Design a protein around this ligand. Structure first.
Ligand SMILES: NC(=O)c1ccc[n+]([C@@H]2O[C@H](COP(=O)([O-])OP(=O)(O)OC[C@H]3O[C@@H](n4cnc5c(N)ncnc54)[C@H](OP(=O)(O)O)[C@@H]3O)[C@@H](O)[C@H]2O)c1
Ligand SMILES: NC(=O)c1ccc[n+]([C@@H]2O[C@H](COP(=O)([O-])OP(=O)(O)OC[C@H]3O[C@@H](n4cnc5c(N)ncnc54)[C@H](OP(=O)(O)O)[C@@H]3O)[C@@H](O)[C@H]2O)c1
Ligand SMILES: NC(=O)c1ccc[n+]([C@@H]2O[C@H](COP(=O)([O-])OP(=O)(O)OC[C@H]3O[C@@H](n4cnc5c(N)ncnc54)[C@H](OP(=O)(O)O)[C@@H]3O)[C@@H](O)[C@H]2O)c1
Ligand SMILES: NC(=O)c1ccc[n+]([C@@H]2O[C@H](COP(=O)([O-])OP(=O)(O)OC[C@H]3O[C@@H](n4cnc5c(N)ncnc54)[C@H](OP(=O)(O)O)[C@@H]3O)[C@@H](O)[C@H]2O)c1
Ligand SMILES: Cc1ccc(Oc2ccccc2)c(O)c1
Ligand SMILES: Cc1ccc(Oc2ccccc2)c(O)c1
Ligand SMILES: Cc1ccc(Oc2ccccc2)c(O)c1
Ligand SMILES: Cc1ccc(Oc2ccccc2)c(O)c1
Ligand SMILES: N[C@@H](CCC(=O)O)C(=O)O
Ligand SMILES: N[C@@H](CCC(=O)O)C(=O)O
Ligand SMILES: N[C@@H](CCC(=O)O)C(=O)O
Ligand SMILES: N[C@@H](CCC(=O)O)C(=O)O
Ligand SMILES: N[C@@H](CCC(=O)O)C(=O)O
Lengths: 255, 255, 255, 255
């Protein structure tokens, strides 16, 4: 994976613990040029400090809230003008109201359910449609998911249904975009201590279970997700699309 | 499988070809009391005509548009007062705009995507929550899905992401309502000529492929979906929950 | 589901706790004629005793060790001569050495691995081939599997790989016999205290993990598997083949 | 992915079309030391000739017929004395009798069934057990499987059941070898013209179906499998075990 002269757009860095920052560090080590997208300024002022650790010679930062078509459209349009054609997108965006991530799934509000779907699933479709405009020779799109999209996990609740939806999103996009030579895949990350992970009910109990039961008997980290993102974003994975790669210490394969 | 002194709510009959009317003939044949819900006054009219084919001595009909919290909430509450406690719900409800059921999935609109999720997946969650109120003793809830929820199938597009969502919805509901003795399951029906089928591009091609490639080499019909629904709604399936049963001539198991 | 004038062959009753005896009580309650096959002379003796609590007017019992082609061939030929044509077969047969079962999977012996395949998987293929001659107009064949065929489960070792083989065997048989109108399916039973459970290390802790985690929060029993077998063996499941129905309180659906 | 100072054992090159020779070319290009195992004289001769395309400063060739324990034990032991500790194994070994790769599954002989299991699935267990001795520090083991192990595919028959078994073998090995920091994974390759493909009935038809229907609308090749093998054998995938990566142009995601 030498990624010199590759350009990747990385969506969803909030702080130094975000899974996308592990992705970022890894691609940065391999010589890629990185463009970053963020939702609010609390991530901008902060992103800017995090980018000091990378060897990125310049900060390419764009505000995009994936709840707005116009921000996704105008965003990717600006990126093309500032930076040219890209080679891929790392999508690491998700959201649910805290109230819907604990206690009873059956009590989920319509508003909260549709919000999770909007941000955590639909946002890949629109990102992919707009990013394709910048990948005329082909490219690669990767989304983060979690095992709770495939099994019912205590507490994860509405996010589990949004992830299930994201994983299908990835397959329907793989089928659509395949003839344009754009591969679309998911990385199912094991549990990692992030900002968003404070929102999930019973998180520490998740970590400990991994350590006890997963084949490798340890948890994974951001850099391990990034190393697999690197394979997926590069030519190493050229025959692989519509795939879900579990980077979770083997936990997915046991019961 | 005798269902005398059982009561089931069937959601989603629009005409004689509906999958839900297959369920109805089977449950009615086995002695159950049925309650029907519908959206369009056209569907109530068809129901009044089709009830003359059933053994149901009286017509129990409720207009419930599942897009309205109020209509579902007041619909079940009313059902409870008219017939008392129920034994299960057969959910056979789905919708997507025609624009979003052909050509390119990467071009799906936000509005088109959330609309399919709202009707086709979330409706199950809110229906279960209100139906739980009429099943103090336990009961059984069954929803209708398609293979396109598990694989990217051509043209099914926004509905496939909706069915993936529905199937996860079934697992999360299974987990949450299990301790209340309420089973939640899914029938994955093979292609059947219905009104809604008319909006799926390539639908004749799908039928023909079943005949040629599925293990049984024949299509299924609505009564066959009904017969598995009887199994799922009844004590026969008492240790079965969170499950997806493919009533599709074996098609899911081949490639 | 009424089964008068039907004839089913049941393989693998050793005693009252056997899963197949649960199948037998259910089919007997439903009016089926039953034929029983056994390996050890002790199982024939338990069978002559267990028959007293069934409605079967005649004991039809046949020694068939599935390690021997000639016993399977001669045994079904003789069944056809004594009772005529049959409507299906319940296969409830598996075996592995303690010595392979009990200690690291990577240390499994060739002879142990192949023995477990032979009895636990290949036996389905030869039985189906011989049973099909007694089903000129179609019928149904059900085999018993366990979740450890789909995931790596602690201690289940060589038998996990044999159940993975057995579930593939079901699909390949489904595809092959589908055009003769013979359906082939699997029941994934949850854990149940039987004579064979005593070969699974940590059985007690598996039982307890179901009660704590399975959506239904309780273990299943042999009758529950029999009620799902009745469904699969009867015309209720007519559009169902190549399927794997989990009768495990929803445990397959959670992580 | 720089593989200098790694040593890998590659099992099952027979000629220039073998999937393992695509693996070899990639690993060799990345700086790895390679050790090759073979069964037939003819294969050792092709290997001698194919080594001239590689940069291997020496030929490390070992006759290992995986039907014999003594050969696998003595093979790896010899390898350990000649090259020292290794970093992993690529397993590219399968076999079935021709008559078992076409026509009707139900007619498979016991001898042919167990022969396919022995060579194509059990071999991984014994090889893992022996290779583990040369990986005190950790390492990576990769097997080659086919989608026919997950679904029933016309003509693949007894090899479909042997791959179902291989894929479970990979999960059970992962669970067992995980605490020794040994990862075990599979690549599910799409169809590729090789010597062994000539035994798969309808092979050309399978290839055309990929071009027509798979997301990427083109077939894969041996080098593309080898690039994924590089990812699995290397530290890029340090968090990935018990996984099955489909290198098949997305065909696994579609129905
Ligand atoms: N950490 C884990 O254990 C874990 C495991 C498996 C999968 N995942 C997945 O990995 C991804 C990243 O989560 P994380 O753990 O890295 O947490 P994180 O650091 O909190 O990242 C979540 C990111 O999503 C962004 N986001 C939320 N709503 C957005 C919107 N409307 N528009 C644009 N961006 C928005 C957030 O930006 P703002 O803060 O600026 O709002 C934040 O950067 C998620 O998809 C998550 O589901 C996480
Ligand atoms: N035919 C197939 O090949 C096939 C295969 C697999 C799964 N299915 C599933 O089977 C289920 C039933 O569909 P079908 O083929 O039987 O078609 P159908 O006869 O057209 O039934 C669709 C039903 O959905 C109802 N519906 C739509 N939106 C609603 C809303 N907002 N509120 C309440 N009801 C609403 C419709 O009622 P109104 O007409 O009153 O609006 C109609 O009764 C669907 O979930 C579908 O996805 C169908
Ligand atoms: N119990 C569970 O929790 C559990 C869970 C999931 C799946 N299962 C499956 O359920 C099935 C029934 O097992 P069980 O638990 O009911 O235990 P069981 O009562 O001990 O029944 C096992 C049966 O296998 C028969 N058998 C073994 N080798 C045979 C051979 N070579 N030829 C003919 N018959 C042979 C035995 O017959 P003989 O006694 O005459 O030797 C015995 O009747 C098995 O396939 C098992 O894997 C069991
Ligand atoms: N081609 C495809 O479309 C495809 C797709 C998916 C998976 N696969 C898998 O890829 C792997 C490699 O096959 P291939 O297509 O590359 O064909 P191949 O070139 O013919 O290789 C098969 C190898 O298996 C070896 N082998 C067979 N029995 C053996 C034994 N008893 N002891 C040691 N080695 C033995 C053969 O060695 P000898 O010639 O010396 O006997 C040969 O080198 C197989 O597992 C196959 O199932 C192939
Ligand atoms: C285990 C886990 C932890 C954190 C996750 O990210 C979230 C969680 C809740 C809301 C938004 C993002 C996640 O997807 C999975
Ligand atoms: C094969 C098939 C046929 C009809 C279906 O029902 C729909 C389809 C699209 C929108 C609403 C209902 C379906 O889910 C699957
Ligand atoms: C949980 C469980 C318990 C018992 C089982 O049956 C066996 C196990 C080992 C050898 C023979 C039969 C089984 O398949 C699964
Ligand atoms: C599509 C395909 C083609 C070739 C294969 O390799 C075999 C096939 C039969 C016996 C030995 C090796 C295979 O596993 C899958
Ligand atoms: N043939 C139409 C629709 C098929 C139908 O449902 O009748 C199309 O492909 O657009
Ligand atoms: N529906 C039946 C039994 C279904 C179930 O097993 O929950 C009842 O109300 O008792
Ligand atoms: N407890 C014993 C036997 C298991 C059992 O069958 O309960 C073991 O784990 O070695
Ligand atoms: N298709 C022919 C030729 C074999 C092959 O394609 O490999 C067959 O039925 O065997
Ligand atoms: N196979 C590499 C590392 C693989 C791993 O991360 O275990 C050496 O050792």
């Amino acid at each position: 994976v030498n990624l010199e002269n590759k350009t990747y757009v990385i969506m969803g860095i909030a702080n130094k613990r975000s899974i996308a920052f592990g992705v970022a560090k890894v691609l940065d080590q391999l010589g890629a040029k990185l463009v970053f997208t963020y939702r609010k300024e609390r991530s901008r002022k902060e992103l800017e400090k995090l980018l000091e650790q990378l060897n990125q010679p310049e900060a390419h930062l764009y505000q995009i809230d994936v709840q707005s078509d116009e921000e996704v459209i105008n965003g990717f349009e600006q990126i093309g003008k500032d930076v040219g054609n890209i080679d891929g997108v790392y999508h690491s965006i998700a959201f649910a109201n805290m109230e819907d991530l604990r206690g009873r799934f059956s009590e989920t509000s319509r508003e909260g359910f549709l919000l999770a779907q909007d941000i955590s699933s639909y946002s890949l479709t629109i990102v992919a449609h707009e990013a394709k405009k910048l990948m005329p020779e082909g490219g690669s799109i990767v989304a983060t998911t979690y095992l709770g999209g495939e099994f019912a996990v205590q507490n994860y609740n509405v996010m589990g249904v949004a992830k299930a939806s994201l994983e299908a999103n990835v397959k329907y996009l793989a089928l659509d975009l395949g003839p344009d030579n754009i591969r679309v895949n998911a990385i199912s990350a094991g549990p990692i201590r992030t900002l968003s992970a404070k929102g999930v009910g019973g998180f520490n109990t998740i970590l400990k279970e991994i350590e006890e039961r997963a084949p490798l008997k340890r948890n994974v980290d951001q850099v391990e997700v990034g190393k697999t993102a690197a394979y997926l974003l590069s030519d190493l994975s050229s025959g692989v699309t519509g795939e879900n790669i579990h980077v979770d210490s083997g936990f997915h394969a046991i019961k």
